[PDB]
RNA sequence: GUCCGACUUUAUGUCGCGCACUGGUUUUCAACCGGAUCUUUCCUUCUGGCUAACCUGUACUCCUUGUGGGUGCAGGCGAACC
């Protein structure tokens with residue numbers, strides 16, 4: 078209930094069940110799930126989207142419980158992980174939307190407040206993903222590399 | 229008060245506590261086995277799905293999103309999984 | 310952000326004991342908590358407790374037998390010499406007759422008298438009496 | 439065809455269990471097409487208080503998945519043939535100790551090679567047909583650990599009387615005593 | 623380092639009083655005297671077959687190592703043919719029963735027989751007064767990368 | 778407690794709360810004492826022989842003495858199915 | 865066992881502090897400190913000493929059949945130390 082960018086104190090979340098093994102009723106096997114996953118990834122779908130689709134359109138509760146491994150790591154296994162994690166990417170996209178708003182009109186000083194907050198979030202994730210050897214440390218971020226990468 | 233068997237509480241007690249305050253984090257969502265009106269392609273549907281799912285064999289809406297559990301499309305039939 | 314898990318554990322223990330609750334729920338349930346509790350029980354200051362698994366750190370349910378009056382942590386794990394422990398005695402133990410300042414040494418989590426008769430000193434954790 | 443399914447042949451008991459497995463291989467049309475890739479890993483017996491015994495076959499954990507896939511019929515037939523005997527399909531483990539500060543870094547040990555990993559998995563597959571639903575532990579006043587285990591009420595009838603054998607086999611496995619309990 | 627044909631400055635670089643014989647029917651390029659410092663240190667390979675001079679090298683140079691041995695972290699590599707090592711440690715102020723992470727930076731001498739990056743972890747040793755900043759001298763670099771030995775992801 | 782010679786010098790070994798396992802004050806005029814008369818097989822009073830429950834007034838203050846009395850009554854085999862170990 | 869206070873110029877059976885000074889510790893006792901160890905249980909291990917030593921094994925024997933007891937010399941325990 079930390080919630081940096083507000084005073085939020087909500088614990089609304091999702092709690093995994095006890096069984097790390099697959100449920101008894103399920104019929105499909107791991108390899109077929111993996112092939113479905115990779116075909117979905119080749120569609121150009123972000124891993125979280127594919128996880129949601131697996132949960133909804135099928136009895137794919139956990140990628141790890143069924144196929145022994147999580148979505149991003151599998152997508153790394155077949156050499157198909159995108160350059161930027163979906164998290165940072167979506168944040169950059171929202172930042173670009175904010176930037177286009179503020180360039181369109183000026184008196185949105187409260188939108189400047191949101192801008193500084195969001196870009197702080199980007200700075201946090203940038204430090205993290207530089208430490209953990211995901212992005213090369215050379216990577217920085219001001220306004221325009223976002224415009225090129227996202228668009 | 230002053231004694232509980234919080235290691236062995238009444239089952240209805242956990243049932244009336246929502247998520248994360250149970251002894252073990254026990255999700256209440258489940259699955260359903262669903263028959264679509266159009267084709268007999270039996271499918272499995274999540275309780276609280278989000279996507280407006282249509283049958284993979286034939287495109288026909290089966291379940292529609294809400295804040296909580298997604299409404300069925302009023303056309304299909306269901307049984308407990 | 311739960312920082313010192315054993316601190317919160319004993320804080321809940323003390324709160325309920327003052328309130329009189331014959332049992333307590335501890336959320337983090339780490340090794341240090343567990344070992345502190347076997348020391349707790351072996352000295353006779355508590356009854357039989359239980360551990361729950363969650364695949365995430367578990368949970369603790371400690372049965373209060375009233376003999377406890379307080380637990381208590383020293384969250385800065387001050388570095389203590391073999392001679393200095395006695396001073397901690399006179400500053401935390403209600404009297405020299407009984408009372409046990411619990412300290413973690415290379416041997417492990419132990420009562421201070423255990424350490425003295427082992428003639429080994431490590432770092433301080435907390436106190437019971 | 440005994441010599442190919444044990445890998446090393448002392449202790450005739452293991453070879454007679456292999457003979458029973460071969461007798462299982464006799465009934466081909468459905469109890470075959472899978473039972474060809476089955477092997478033994480220095481089977482050991484386990485004593486049980488009261489007179490009964492519990493057989494402990496061991497698996498190089500290679501395709502133990504195929505075992506647990508076709509397990510139950512093999513289990514029941516082995517019980518029927520080896521009378522008064524309860525076979526347990528353990529995953530044979532080459533478990534590793536922890537790196538000591540004195541000891542030199544020796545290719546850091548993956549957690550799969552931990553006492554916790556082997557003990558948890560061996561409990562998980564002790565009663566295979568039903569998953570353990572929960573884990574508990576108590577620490578007695580005398581200073582003894584007792585681990586309590588909660589198994590699903592559903593699918594319990596497939597054992598229903600071998601809990602004592604499970605206690606015996608695992609207590610002699612490690613000395614960490616076990617008492618089961620079933621929810622309603 | 624001395625960067626690509628050490629014989630660069632206004633004077634020649636020759637390990638003193640070692641004679642390169644023109645009278646030997648050998649065409650053996652040069653005689654490079656070398657030696658192991660000791661204390662369980664291994665003289666690196668690139669020192670024996672090198673061509674540089676580094677009079678202040680512990681192995682190929684003139685200086686003799688003796689006294690203190692320390693461990694530290696490379697902090698600055700800009701300076702030519704030398705290095706600066708930061709040393710961060712804890713200080714027990716007695717008034718508060720607490721330790722104190724302060725740093726002391728010390729310059730040392732690097733032979734061309736070593737490759738150094740910022741932030742490397744290096745064992746350093748004591749030596750003769752080399753410069754008003756340099757009184758220590760490097761021995762060898764253990765953590766050559768820290769975490770960067772693997773950088774690509776091509777499975 | 779004891780002398781070096783081996784004598785109980787301490788005056789007033791205290792009573793301990795039958796409910797919360799705690800000492801009883803002498804000046805806190807809220808401690809309660811409950812006398813439960815034993816009843817013979819045939820339905821008569823048994824004066825002289827009867828059990829006692831010393832309950833500290835602390836539970837009379839917090840307000841949960843009722844559950845405590847139910848607990849002790851059921852556990853001691855005098856009362857039937859009033860108190861529960863699991864609520 | 866040594867023996868000490870009641871018993872006074874001197875001493876003992878007897879009553880006593882049920883050992884005032886010293887052991888076996890299987891007297892069951894309790895510990896608590898390690899040490900060896902069986903753990904799927906590393907406590908870094910080789911390259912050589914030196915072999916400390918006895919699975920050694922050579923004559924088998926000083927000898928009551930009897931392992932009560934050892935000089936001995938290629939495999940071979942090193943951890944007793946280099």
Ligand SMILES: [Zn+2]
Pocket residue numbers: 264266267269283284285286287
């Ligand atoms: Zn359809």
